[PDB]
């Protein structure tokens, strides 16, 4: 024991969040710069 | 040394003379209030060890 | 001997490629737009 | 009832350190610069009148 | 001042001159104001002080080819303690900077009771450094600066909050306040110090704090001297 | 103008050592400059006459096509040579002794600055810029000469003694200093610079929620505050410290091009908006500080990045200190 | 009223008996008994932890905290991090451990001011 | 003034005519007093200085057989924003109200930074009511005046002692003393409000408030607009 690598889960559940921040990167970021240009 | 930044005149000058008056008082009846409040806190120190 | 872990945390390393991927695809999208409104002033 | 009342006194004492050191002092101060430039205006006037 | 110009200019000495009460001098030239029937200044002072009072301190400096000079130190009583009279407050617009005596520090026991904050030396930039005295030297006093004040703000904030209540930065910076009034500011009053050994004493209050906490100091002077011992 | 001669000397002494590239060579600023001197020991009755050449001296090289920017220290000086010749006319005193003509004179003199287009041909285009210093009686802007020049001119850079004394420098009073230009100067930060203005404006509303924090916290302490007051109160701080504050006497920070001066507002906003986000995603401020202080001391310590290492090496510096920043706030919040 | 409740953090000497003979050991509408059983060396300090923050934090009913030594002394940091007013948390001896009035947290804020 | 006089009568134009800078000509009348030796009143200004700003101000208005008139704007900048300077307040005692732009308000980020309370138009009275604006305008403004006054004594309030210990109606004054300077006073340049958006602006900013401190409003126009 004392050898389990959950950290494998860290690593994916960092890459999950990592997608869900793409969403929100191209929701607001479009969105902000898109609103500057108009 | 530090003050309000509020324009010279007469009014003004009446106006902060009160409120010196008023926190003065207001000092002495905070003062009063603290005393009172630090027998009742010896007295429950006292009793919540007992 | 738990070394592993500090090689997976790549993560880490795919976040930040993520991100620069998404300022890089900004720059492509605010395109269409940004000829689109200079077009119109142009006409 | 030493819960309470210890959060009381410690709000209480601030306050008159704050009264005392902070907001006394400055009242103090206001009320010598608005003398003294009362006094500048009086002199002006009087001294104008005088000329 | 024409006694010293003679010595300095003509005969190629050093002369340092002391003018003590320059506000006995004020108070003459707004006697005589009054006497004129002039239209007074502020408080009561002649509107022409400023020129008359430049005429007697700009009589001080070095001159081209001349290899003596005038240093002026004269002394100023500013009544009430207050800085902003127009006897003090002319002569900082007029002079080069200012040693300020604090009646504060005199109570406190302290001597010289000189407060660095309100003072100035305005030729300091200039004559300290590398070739001149030693490069850690405006690093220092800067740093110095911006610490003593941090203190002065930490003790006002106790006398509310009380000393629990203060951050640890705080709580260094009072640490170097009363360190640095009772050690470095205090002095015998026939005791010299070498600028270099008050930069050793400067130093050492400076190491009361993490090295990241020396914002003002360059990181090459804070390599070479904050280690140093 | 009715200011110290060692002013002068000092110059005189400098300008020929240091070197501008605005011809695209090495050349002493000397070269470019004109002094009129009238220190305070002077004729009095001079300091005027100083100051209206000055400003003709200026007025001609604008006629020249060149910007030309004069500096008056101090007008303050030029003010009280009017009120004693006032004085010895026995004319009636208007605002603090002086004459009443005083705002007139002012605001004639400052109408002399302007972008202009020269008289004759060929066609050619000058400007000349007026700074002038103000030195009320007392440190007190109530001063007749400051309450007409702030009527007059349109950026007040405003000084504070407070700052002064703790050797902050400059000693800009943030809360009453304005520039009425910012509006007109758009159109050159979209060409160069897009996001300046953005920024210079987020850093003014991070100055001022510190600014009413503080107020709140002298009196009742750091106690009772959101982790989001205490980021702002902390990255004012560091603001005010690293940015705002700037050693005019060092080999780093005597000159800050602006470019320099946008990648740094663009380190400290980053600092905030990550620290803000790292917060409101959970994150404790106290331990989250403990742990990034070295990402804090990098952004602070950006400011002694050369600007004599180039734009492109400075720029690239910047740009690893946002990375590296950003890679290290993710680090410490998971 | 607003709050009223009892809550009990002590082994089955305690919690099932003594007072439970008048104080009872479940709420009107809940099925957690703002109690644990805290089995010699079966429950987890962890678990511990957990427990006095349902009890303390997680819901509002509980009017005191009545909490046994054994846990104490183990959940030393977190009941001395607690600085709250309502759940007026009391430390009880039991079985054959004394009252160690040098231990619990209310009385050493006492001693440390003002005596 | 004799130009827009010629178009507001002998021409019967109704004219706005705005004497920008008014504050100014003062100075030139100080300068000119001065030059004459005159007995100078406050701050050195000629004594006569409400009649020549009264012969100036006094210069608009509408007149019975014409159907032209003179709406005057003089703009005035107080020095060291001292409402008690003899300009701003000679023109005080001269004008029919004062529009007050504030330094606060300004710093503050809010456009246009009119402090309404120093501010005052002495022809409202007149021009607000039944049939020719609304019935709610007076009650409303003298509602709006006694929230704002009460938000600004609840803000110093919190500013010494924090909210804690200041009522609930100085809560509701907070929140209100918020949206009234963000939403209602703020106004973007170009932005153009009829008189009624404003009038229903305000009713909803004094809905943050219960119908019973609302007590500068009669019950008649408290029943028909405090519930819309």
Known sequence: AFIRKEAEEKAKEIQLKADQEYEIEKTNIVRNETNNID | GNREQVFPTRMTLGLMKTKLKGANQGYSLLKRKSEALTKRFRDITKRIDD | KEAHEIVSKARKYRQDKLKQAKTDAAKEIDSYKIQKDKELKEF | AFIILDEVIKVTNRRVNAIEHVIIPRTENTIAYINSELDELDREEFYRLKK | ?229 | CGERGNEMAEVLMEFPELYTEMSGTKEPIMKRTTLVANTSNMPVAAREASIYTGITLAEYFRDQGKNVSMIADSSSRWAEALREISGRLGEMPADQGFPAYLGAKLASFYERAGKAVALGSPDRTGSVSIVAAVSPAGGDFSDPVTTATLGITQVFWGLDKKLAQRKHFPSINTSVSYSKYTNVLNKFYDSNYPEFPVLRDRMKEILSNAEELEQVVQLVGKSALSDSDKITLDVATLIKEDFLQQNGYSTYDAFCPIWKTFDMMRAFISYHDEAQKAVANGANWSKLADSTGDVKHAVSSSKFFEPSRGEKEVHGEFEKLLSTMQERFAESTD | EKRTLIAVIADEDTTTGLLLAGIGQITPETQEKNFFVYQEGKTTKEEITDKFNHFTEERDDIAILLINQHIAENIRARVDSFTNAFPAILEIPSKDHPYDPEKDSVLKRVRKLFG
């Open chain 5, 1 to 229: 001042l024409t006694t010293a110009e003679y010595l300095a200019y003509q005969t190629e000495r050093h002369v340092l001159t002391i003018l003590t009460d320059m506000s006995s001098y004020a108070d003459a030239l707004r006697e005589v104001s009054a006497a004129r029937e002039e239209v007074p200044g502020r408080r009561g002072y002649p509107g022409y002080m400023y020129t008359d009072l430049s005429t007697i301190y700009e009589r001080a400096g070095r001159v081209e080819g001349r290899n003596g000079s005038i240093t002026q130190i004269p002394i100023l009583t500013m009544p009430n303690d207050d800085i902003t009279h127009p006897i003090p407050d002319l002569t900082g617009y007029i002079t080069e900077g200012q040693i300020f005596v604090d009646r504060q520090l005199h109570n406190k026991g302290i001597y010289p009771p000189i407060n660095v904050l309100p003072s100035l030396s305005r030729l300091m930039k200039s004559a300290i450094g590398e070739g001149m005295t030693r490069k850690d030297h405006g690093d220092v006093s800067n740093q110095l600066y911006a610490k003593y004040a941090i203190g002065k703000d930490a003790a006002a904030m106790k006398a509310v909050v009380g000393e629990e209540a203060l951050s640890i930065e705080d709580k260094l910076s009072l640490e170097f306040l009363e360190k640095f009034e009772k050690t470095f500011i205090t002095q015998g009053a026939y005791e010299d110090r070498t600028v270099f050994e008050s930069l050793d004493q400067a130093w050492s209050l400076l190491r009361i704090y993490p090295k990241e906490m020396l914002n003002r100091i360059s990181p090459k002077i804070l390599d070479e001297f904050y280690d140093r011992a």
